[PDB]
Structure 1
Amino acid sequence: SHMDTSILNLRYESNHLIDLSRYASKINIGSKVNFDPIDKNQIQLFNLESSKIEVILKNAIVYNSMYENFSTSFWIRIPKYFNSISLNNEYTIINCMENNSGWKVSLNYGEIIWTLQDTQEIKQRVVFKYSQMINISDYINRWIFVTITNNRLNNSKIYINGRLIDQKPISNLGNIHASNNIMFKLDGCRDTHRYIWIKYFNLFDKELNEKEIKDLYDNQSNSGILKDFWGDYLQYDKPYYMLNLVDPNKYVDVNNVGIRGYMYLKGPRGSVMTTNIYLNSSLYRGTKFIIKKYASGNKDNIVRNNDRVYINVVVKNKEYRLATNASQAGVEKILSALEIPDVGNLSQVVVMKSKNITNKCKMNLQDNNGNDIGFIGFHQFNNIAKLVASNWYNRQSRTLGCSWEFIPVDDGWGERPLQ
């Protein structure tokens, strides 16, 4: 059983951002809106008057009620707040308020906020708060799924990545008369360099339930394409820093290249900070990995689930090949960084797998017959957490050391590489 209650379903199709709902509400795109070159559903809004999108709702669907239930969902990527200018500065990003009644999404330092206000200025807020004083954040500068539901008899709820975060009572609000238009735009933000990314805005004419929200979250994640740490499509030929999810305070290094050497995790990462604003683990540490095309016949640059690839490791501005001799005794096969011309018959083919919580990747090493050597993780040998391929992993959650994320340099993180 399924029920459609769509009032606005904003999507890039053909060659245009349009409303796919039967209403086909009219859209105006300002001249300073950016779109991602590969996924044109990703919309970037700057702190500029012309970086905006306005939706004019059909009259039959404007919200003007005491009892009508409604929900919204959208994905958002919010760059790290860098300066004290952001500290006590709530700014609207999605506005459907007219004359101090309606609804809006706003942001503040470490916050996503939903506000409802009735025509007698009775107001309620539901708030998601996330810290910037944290080693590794699930939320800072990463694609987040937002869902907000409204039941006029009881509660408004905000969900993040399909999980309930905050619920507050709204049964005391009366007539909420929202705007005829929805304005996507940074409104009242003092940080001149602030922006957001947004995608897949929806409005629904019901209170969505927990199952509907989960299904919506799973579907829109696009599990067929692997993601980087930030939640963008993972790509071939792109240098990435590595994060192991069970040892997040460690980074990948190599001692020596060639079959006598090995790679290993070491830490701590050390810190990036601006006093009273953020304090996080440094992300741009260790040897970079580059994903290389092997078996995929697709001619775009995206790494798909189950793609069979090679992995290059960058040491001193030179590319080596991640590889192992699977014959070595023990289920754990230690990985080395080989000269590319000299890899010979060593195992190097990696099956890339997306795992669906944040943006998880697995890497299943295979020999040249296509037989499994195993998922790449790590193993303690003496004092040293060496990288290995091990079928022990394949034969077993966030317990295991075989989950990884790939971190490219991104403007919304602000860290400067050490070199």
Structure 2
Amino acid sequence: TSILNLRYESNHLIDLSRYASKINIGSKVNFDPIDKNQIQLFNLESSKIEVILKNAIVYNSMYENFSTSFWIRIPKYFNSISLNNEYTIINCMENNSGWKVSLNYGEIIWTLQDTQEIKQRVVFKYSQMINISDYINRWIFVTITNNRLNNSKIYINGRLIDQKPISNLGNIHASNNIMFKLDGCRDTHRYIWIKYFNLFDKELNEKEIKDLYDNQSNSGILKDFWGDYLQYDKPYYMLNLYDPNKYVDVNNVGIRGYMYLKGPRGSVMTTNIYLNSSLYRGTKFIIKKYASGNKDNIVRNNDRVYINVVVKNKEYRLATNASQAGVEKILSALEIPDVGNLSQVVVMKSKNQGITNKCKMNLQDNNGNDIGFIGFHQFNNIAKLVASNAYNRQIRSSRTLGCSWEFIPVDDGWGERPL
């Protein structure tokens, strides 16, 4: 259905569509080594990608419908230089006609203009004054559809955000090429991550957009907070979606100690620019390889692993004694050499047979049996972390649960200073 399918095939970025439009990569374009489909464009002159569209698919019409989709990770806007400064990022305008995607402080703009100076804009806006943002510095799926008879629509993660009429626009003659480059951006350290760009010769419907969203999600691979693939041997600050205001801490190390959700999660801010909940708090978790010959360091849907915990700069092993009384098994931080026969094998999870689910850690005993998903339980006003089979069952519901976690690694797009 796509007339343009930009994907990193072999060792080059090409167009997997039947048209095979030529692609020129500037010398300052960065590709994520662990997932070369993710492209990083800096606010630097030669950090650009130009797509030369086959003359056959260049838009030039009064009634042809078309859409476009792609994922993007926009770093948090850090200071006043980014206020009121709309910069283009994907340009298909030629002689002031065609389309283009732009950004500005807290927004993603779509622009359509015909050859008679008649134009329309569709915008998505998100705030940087929020505890936990689904959008800031995280991979978002953007979809823009255009029905020449009535409206243009912008979707974010499969849901309709806004729509505007375009029926009054006459002939639109877009550009022969598409320029992916930060244009007119005043912030010298600005950049964006983008991947899976597509172009369609029709107005995608809600269902098609959803299937596009679910399929390009790679549901078989776990993701960290930013939406990147979850990795092994990579320290992560933990976030429990059920109770975001707290962070993981360790009472004491050892079998007679425990892990719990401590006091108030802080806030990070830059006056007049952003105010969000602190994300680099608590004892870090490191996913360790168990009985695996994993070449890459990517964590997949049913991988069996070990969870190391960092306490006062020393790594310990997450474990528990399942013989413990009660359904909820309280977890502890064990000296690695002394884990003995304690349960410690964790099955990572990204989906149920089933759909997405945030509960991603199912502890198993040494007999290959479920102890339960890792979450937390209230023990006399103390929220200790536990592995509970109760979670498994209630999962009959895809809502946020006590076992819904988020792994957050340090990222430059967030800008918070750790420790």
| 277-286 or 388-397, which deviates more | 388-397
With the length of structure 2 as denominator, give the TM-score of the two structures. 0.97
Q: 1:20-58 CA distances to partner (integer Å, 9 max, x unpaired)?
A: 111110000000000001100110000011000000111
Could you give the per-residue CA deviations for residues 228-249 of structure 1, whole angstroms, max 9, x where no partner exists?
Answer: 1001111101110001111111
Q: Indicate whether 1:369 and 2:370 are aligned.
A: no
2:239·2:405 contact (CA, 8 Å) conserved in 1?
yes
Aligned-partner SS, 2:81: helix
Identity of aligned residues (%): 100
CA positional deviation for 1:358: 9.7
- Structure 1 residue ranges (4+ consecutive) displaced by more than 2 angstroms after TM superposition: 295-298, 355-361
Partners in 2 of 1:374 and 1:35 — Cα distance?
38
1:140 partnered with 2:136: yes
Q: Tell whether the 8 Å contact from 2:236 to 2:407 is kept in structure 1 after alignment.
A: yes
What residue ranges of structure 2 are gaps of 5+ in the alignment? none
* Alpha-carbon distance, 1:326 to partner: 0.8
Any idea what the Cα deviations from partners look like across 1:329-369, whole Å, max 9, x if unmatched?
A: 11000000000000100110000001499993510000000
For the residues of structure 1 that align with 2:356 and 2:278, how far apart are their CA atoms? Answer: 18
1:206/1:138 Cα in 2 relative to 1: closer, same or farther (>3 Å)?
same
Q: Secondary structure at the match of 2:350?
A: strand
Q: How far apart are residue 71 of structure 1 and its match? A: 0.4
Mapped partners of 2:241, 2:263: distance in 1:
13
Gaps of 5+ in 1: none
Relative to 1, partners in 2 of residues 1:24 and 1:362: Cα closer, same or farther, differing over 3 Å?
same
Task: Give the CA RMSD over aligned residues.
Answer: 1.3
User: 1:245-292 CA deviation, whole Å, 9 max, x = no partner?
Assistant: 111111100011001111101232111111111000010000000000
Does residue 226 (structure 1) correspond to residue 219 (structure 2)? The answer is no
After superposition, the C-alpha distances for 1:298-357 in whole angstroms (9 at most, x for unaligned) are 321110111000000001111100010111111000000000000100110000001499
* Total equivalences in the alignment: 414
Q: CA 1:372–1:254 in structure 2 vs 1: closer, same or farther (change >3 Å)? A: same
Equivalent pair of 1:393/1:402 in contact (CA under 8 Å)? yes
Q: Report if the CA contact (8 A) 2:7-2:15 is conserved.
A: yes
Give the direction of change, closer, same or farther, for the CA distance of 1:159–1:358 in structure 2 (3 Å limit).
Answer: farther
CA distance in 2 between partners of 1:342 and 1:253 (Å): 21
Three-state SS of the structure 2 residue aligned to 1:361 is coil
CA contact (8 A) 2:102 2:109 kept: yes
Contact 2:129–2:275, Cα closer than 8 Å, also in 1: yes
Are the equivalent residues in 1 in contact too, given 2:219–2:356 (CA < 8 A)? Answer: no
Deviations 1:373-395 (A, max 9, x none): 00000000011110000001111
Alpha-carbon shift at residue 296 of structure 1 (Å): 3.1
Distance in 2 of aligned mates of 1:379 and 1:388:
7
TM-score by length of 1: 0.97
CA contact under 8 A between 1:227 and 1:360: conserved in structure 2? no
Q: Does 1:406 align with 2:415?
A: no
Say whether the 8 Å CA contact 1:229–1:359 is kept in structure 2.
no
Structure 1 residues 233, 361: CA separation in 2 closer, same or farther (over 3 Å shift)? farther
